[PDB]
Ligand binder design. Structure first.
Ligand SMILES: CCCCC[C@H](O)/C=C/[C@@H]1[C@@H](C/C=C/CCCC(=O)O)[C@H]2CO[C@@H]1C2
Length: 1218
């Protein structure tokens, strides 16, 4: 993939003409990783990594030689000054041009000030001055992008070298240091702390060009307007701390919202996750109240933050007006006079020096500080203790053999007992050494010591040969299965097929689409644990080293495949291979040529399996211990009257902005056309101050009103969302995952909270300033309207031709960035496996090949934006050239003031036009959040919570529940679930449910609570369920869910969220479940704040809490589901006895997985694959041997079935015959 940047001219690299081909492909189809362009030879990650590592090693060597701390900053400066000084040389020219061109503006205006149509020499000099002006703008517009590319490329280069060295160091970290750090702290300086280098360079040169330009402009101002300049200049300096006091008060109102936004998101997580429980309990009004309170206390801080942001942006808007106003007020008050040249040169000087002082220099300070902090972090990460490179091997005679003598070691220098105590044993080729020991013996530490991963404290380890190692936890990296097995080794067909067959991988390969070529991501998300272990064993076999270490390989696989692996691979293939095995299955010890027992870190005994049979020590003994979106976004915030007022306020602000400078123009014209006589100063200063004040107030009003309207618009959208999701049926929650629903209320809501109203108040600001500039240039020279139409239309087409490729390349630099982090993560978790093989240098090449794929999409993202900016500045330069020259070919009609106004505004169009375009792109990027928010504000809705026909208060009177021909389906068009359900439930009876998992046992609750409006009829005391709203049907039925959940809050709430009960009632209810005492030893009585799902509570305790809830509701209907999954037997029988003897007179339906729970129930649904077949007393069903109840009783066993039948008979005989 050749790069046209390498074969291009200078005239082609200034206009980025080498990039036209790609754009043409980008206009037709979508862009992939093949349409991409490769990188320069001087940009491959390996090259920069090697160079900067060389300089860093030299610097640390000199630090050792001179006994002071080494600094990475010095290495960076040493490696980059020779190539960073060039950029500085050019930015000096750029700032010099930005300071020079006002003077030639002044010379043109001065030619207009002394107009004489006959003096053609002055006309020619003015044409020359205009030509120099266009040269300045064409070196500020066309040569500033082949500069900005290289300024961003220096940062790209620095970051790529940094990432390469970080990975290189993290590949050889010592376990002493690797344990004190984490694997999240080794990705959080390669994903968030190495990105600063991509930005600091962009502004680095402004730490010396900022002040220099601020002195040059000040000197020019003094030369032209004199001491009064300081006055205005003073105001500009005031903008430096004032900008850093809207930041130490914005960051106190922005980090005081997280303590509310995160609370709101966490409550939303608990609401969305357990929505079945909330709906069944009919509690969602309580969570609605809680989220309303949190969202209101979050909108308060968002409203202060947005008001402050709006005031800051209006200060940015009106700062130039204030500077010019105070400057010329002082200039006139000290006794001088206004002419149209000194005014409109000083204006451009103030514009340039303001754009430098208030915008670029603080950003450079911030970014240099962030880059210095990041450099300090990467300094700390590169001084961690390394691993001793495997040193000079003692001269052997060619005998590949492992011998250990008197080995002692510690994982920590603080541990009292050493991990190993004087181990002195060896192994020879062909001898399958094995280790027997319970967990905690040190067998893993033993293999680590064999690998050298554990530092020897005493003794010696002699390992001479290639080492093949298998970790206890199988480790798979990002790649195909064949590549996973090869692990860099070249493929050999017969050597790859024997591995496959001996590892029994054929089944797994035939299960997947690509056979053995299926791509396996990180953590084995596409594989199973057995597959991971088998692929790791395949890697170990195919690497075919001299020495093999296997730590618990067969534990996680089935018996047959494990036996096959041990026999035909470990016993057969490795019978000629040095092998050390750690095992937990005793069956495989018979084939071990040796056995070592390790305990308390000490050798217990080595010998053959026969000798341990003779020792009398049984092993078990040892092993046991569009446009519509914008309209909907703007309609929500305010009615259209306020929107029309907003438009009028924008127009008034911009018009007053323009008219202040127009007033300076008019003042100059009225002064030149004079005569001693004077000019009435009070009037002129009065209207000039009035225009300045109008500009300031209208800017502030516009900013606050736009922020208020869009914040209100977001507040309304969020409220509509939330109150439209609390009413969505559970089917919607089944279709969409939690993450997608728990992200459109934290990510999407957060984008329209304090992101959307900024790029939308900035975009309007700069769009109206551009329109003001264009309208001034058209009102001064109307003929400009003719050429300016071929500069609108072209622009429009341009903005398409770019946005059909930028959006196709700002996803490539995102979908090819994650592989770097993925490989870094996958290489640290299997790091021992990587370093066990000598091929650690080969993973460096894989990292580079994953980094020469993101430094190849940052290339296109850095050059396509420049191909757009060159043409935008060509359009703006055509505009300024036409304004500067066409004001001279028409010199007979214009005057000094009009020319000054038009030409100075055309000069300030630069950069402003680009920022307008950039914010337009960002708004069109961030309206997707509004689109998603408005997609959820129009979701499905279940039947309303209230109906006209409210039920009688006594209902249910008894509990009679009649299922009449109930046909229920989870989703429309899906499989029938309950089909002609016809049953009767008489008050107070106990009806168990039997069936298969998913055969309709858990759908009766789904249909009886109308979680999905059923077809058929259900009568609760002769009242149709579908004829009453949900909260008059669910409030009168209690339930015990499968997995109890406690909602974050006081224990008062998880029982009485509506405050409808009193402390004595709650205490009594908790006493009935005997957990009363268990609570009155907590910090609070009931007001103990809890964790997620009551993490300080047990599953049985949670079931007790729900049982207490059911007791508190004291309604005459009740449903139990999955009583005790794996709860301890004491709590099991406790719950069971409470289920009977508290709820004797409360009609009970029970859906249980077992029989003892429901053996004594009065009756039983028998559900046959979604069909009710048998329903009577359990003893009657046991009388008929053909009943499914009889069959599933007998399936348990003989004694169990006999006891169950005896219990049923006892119940029958005690009940029906008194
Ligand atoms: C994407 C290209 C942007 C061009 C930047 C241009 O040279 C800026 C000039 C001023 C802009 C302020 C820029 C903001 C700083 C950019 C830094 C950042 O966004 O991280 C807007 C306020 O008046 C004009 C437009």
């Amino acid at each position: 993939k050749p790069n046209p940047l390498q074969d291009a001219n200078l005239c082609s690299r200034v206009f980025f003409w080498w990039l036209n081909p790609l754009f043409k492909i980008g206009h037709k189809r979508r862009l992939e990783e093949d349409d991409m362009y490769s990188v320069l030879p001087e940009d491959r990650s390996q090259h920069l990594g090697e160079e900067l590592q060389g300089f860093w090693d030299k610097e640390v060597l000199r630090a050792e030689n001179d006994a002071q701390k080494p600094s990475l900053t010095r290495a960076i400066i040493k490696c980059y000054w020779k190539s960073y000084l060039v950029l500085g040389i050019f930015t000096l020219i750029e700032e010099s041009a930005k300071v020079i061109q006002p003077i030639f503006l002044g010379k043109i205006i001065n030619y207009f000030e002394n107009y004489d149509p006959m003096d053609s020499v002055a006309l020619n000099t003015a044409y020359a001055y205009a030509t120099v002006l266009t040269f300045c703008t064409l070196i500020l517009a066309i040569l500033h992008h082949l500069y900005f590319y290289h300024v961003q490329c220096a940062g790209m280069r620095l970051r790529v070298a940094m990432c390469h060295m970080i990975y290189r160091k993290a590949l050889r970290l010592s376990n002493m240091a690797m344990g004190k750090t984490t694997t999240g702290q080794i990705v959080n300086l390669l994903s968030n702390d190495v990105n600063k280098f991509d930005q600091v360079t962009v502004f680095l040169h402004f730490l010396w060009a900022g002040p220099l330009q601020a002195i040059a402009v000040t000197a020019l101002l003094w030369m032209e307007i004199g001491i009064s300049c300081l006055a205005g200049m003073a105001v500009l300096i005031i903008l430096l701390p004032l900008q850093s006091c809207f930041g130490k008060l914005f960051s106190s109102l922005r980090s005081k919202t997280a303590t509310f936004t995160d609370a709101r998101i966490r409550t939303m997580n608990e609401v969305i996750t357990g929505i079945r429980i909330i709906k069944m309990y009919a509690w969602e009004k309580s969570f609605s109240n809680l989220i309303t309170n949190l969202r209101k206390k979050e909108i308060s801080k968002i409203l202060r933050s947005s008001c402050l942001r709006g005031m800051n942006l209006a200060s940015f808007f009106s700062a130039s007006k204030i500077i010019v106003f105070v400057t010329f007020t002082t200039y006139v008050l000290l006794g001088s006079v206004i002419t149209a040249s000194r005014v409109f040169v000083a204006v451009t000087l103030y514009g340039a020096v303001r754009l430098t002082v208030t915008l670029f220099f603080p950003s450079a300070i911030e970014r240099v500080s962030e880059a210095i902090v990041s450099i300090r972090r990467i300094q700390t990460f590169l001084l961690l203790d390394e691993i001793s490179q495997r040193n000079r091997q003692l001269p052997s005679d060619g005998k590949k053999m492992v011998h250990v003598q008197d080995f002692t070691a510690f994982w920590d220098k603080a541990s009292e007992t050493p991990t190993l105590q004087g181990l002195s044993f060896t192994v020879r080729p062909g001898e399958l050494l094995a280790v027997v020991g319970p967990v905690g013996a040190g067998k893993s530490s033993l293999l680590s010591a064999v690998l050298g991963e554990l530092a020897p404290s005493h003794g010696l380890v002699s390992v001479h040969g290639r080492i093949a190692y298998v970790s206890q936890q199988p480790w798979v990296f990002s790649g195909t299965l064949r590549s996973n097995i090869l692990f860099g080794k070249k493929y050999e067909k017969e050597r790859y097929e024997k591995v496959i067959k001996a590892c029994a991988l054929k089944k797994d390969l035939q299960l997947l689409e690509d056979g053995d070529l299926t791509v396996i991501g990180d953590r084995g998300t596409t594989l199973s644990g057995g597959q991971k272990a088998r692929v790791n064993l395949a890697r170990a076999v195919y690497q075919d080293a001299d020495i093999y270490l296997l730590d618990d390989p067969l534990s996680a696989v089935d018996a047959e495949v494990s036996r096959h692996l041990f026999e035909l691979c470990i016993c057969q293939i490795l019978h000629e291979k040095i092998t050390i095995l750690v095992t937990h299955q005793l069956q495989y010890l018979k084939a071990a040529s040796q056995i070592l027992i390790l305990k308390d870190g000490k050798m217990v005994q080595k010998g053959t399996y026969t000798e341990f049979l003779k020792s009398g020590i049984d092993f078990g003994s040892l092993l046991k211990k569009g446009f519509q979106a914008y309209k909907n976004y703007f309609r929500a915030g305010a009615h259209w009257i306020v929107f029309i007022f907003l438009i009028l306020l924008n127009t008034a602000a911009q018009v007053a902005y323009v008219l202040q400078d127009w007033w300076l123009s008019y003042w100059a014209n009225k002064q030149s056309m004079l005569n001693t006589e004077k000019l009435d100063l009070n009037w002129y200063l009065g209207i000039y101050s009035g225009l300045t004040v109008a500009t300031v107030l209208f800017g502030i009003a516009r900013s606050l009103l736009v922020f208020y309207v869009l914040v209100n618009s977001s507040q309304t959208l969020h409220n509509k969302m939330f109150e439209s999701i609390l009413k969505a049926p559970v089917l919607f929650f089944d279709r969409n995952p939690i993450g997608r629903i728990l992200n459109r209320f934290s990510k999407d809501i957060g984008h329209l909270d304090d992101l959307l109203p900024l790029t939308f108040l900035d975009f309007i600001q700069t769009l109206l300033q551009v329109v003001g500039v264009v309208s001034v240039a058209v009102a001064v020279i109307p003929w400009i309207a003719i050429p300016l139409v071929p500069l609108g239309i072209i622009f429009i087409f341009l903005r398409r031709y770019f946005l059909e490729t930028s959006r196709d390349v700002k996803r490539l630099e995102s979908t090819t960035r994650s592989p770097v982090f993925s490989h870094l993560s996958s290489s640290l978790q299997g790091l021992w496996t990587i370093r066990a093989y000598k091929a650690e240098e080969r993973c460096q090449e894989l990292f580079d090949a994953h980094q020469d794929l993101h430094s190849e999409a940052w290339f296109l993202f850095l050059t396509t934006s420049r191909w757009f900016a060159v043409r935008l500045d060509a359009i703006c330069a055509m505009f300024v050239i036409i304004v500067a020259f066409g004001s001279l070919i028409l010199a007979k009609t214009l005057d000094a003031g009009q020319v000054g106004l038009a030409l100075s505004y055309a000069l300030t169009l630069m950069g402003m036009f680009q920022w307008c375009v950039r914010q337009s792109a960002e708004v069109e990027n961030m309206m997707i959040s509004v689109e998603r928010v408005i997609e959820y504000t129009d979701l499905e809705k279940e039947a309303p919570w209230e109906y006209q026909k409210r039920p009688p208060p006594a209902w249910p009177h008894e509990g009679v529940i009649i299922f009449d021909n109930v046909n229920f389906m989870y989703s429309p068009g899906g499989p029938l679930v309950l089909k002609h359900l016809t049953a009767l439930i008489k008050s107070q009876e106990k009806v168990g449910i039997v069936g298969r998992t998913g055969a309709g046992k858990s759908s009766l609750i789904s249909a009886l609570f109308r979680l999905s409006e059923p077809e058929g009829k259900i009568w609760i005391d002769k009242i149709l369920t579908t004829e009453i709203g949900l909260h008059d049907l669910r409030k009168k039925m209690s339930i015990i869910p499968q997995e109890p959940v406690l909602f974050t809050g006081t224990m008062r709430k998880n029982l009485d969220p509506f405050n409808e009960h009193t402390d004595e009632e709650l205490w009594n209810a908790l006493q009935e479940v005997q957990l009363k005492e268990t609570i009155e030893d907590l910090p609070g009585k009931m007001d103990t704040e809890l964790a997620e799902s009551g993490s300080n509570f047990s599953v049985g305790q949670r079931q007790l809490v729900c049982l207490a809830r059911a007791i508190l509701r004291k309604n005459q209907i009740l449903i139990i589901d999955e009583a005790t999954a794996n709860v301890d037997p004491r709590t099991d029988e406790l719950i069971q006895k409470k289920i009977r003897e508290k709820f004797a007179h409360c009609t009970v339906l029970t859906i249980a997985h077992r029989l003892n729970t429901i053996i004594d129930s009065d009756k039983i649904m028998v559900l046959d694959s979604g069909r009710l077949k048998e329903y009577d007393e359990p003893y009657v069903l046991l009388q008929n041997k053909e009943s499914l109840f009889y069959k599933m009783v007998q399936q348990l066993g003989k004694a169990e079935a006999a006891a169950l039948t005896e219990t049923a008979k006892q119940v029958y005989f005690k009940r029906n015959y008194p």
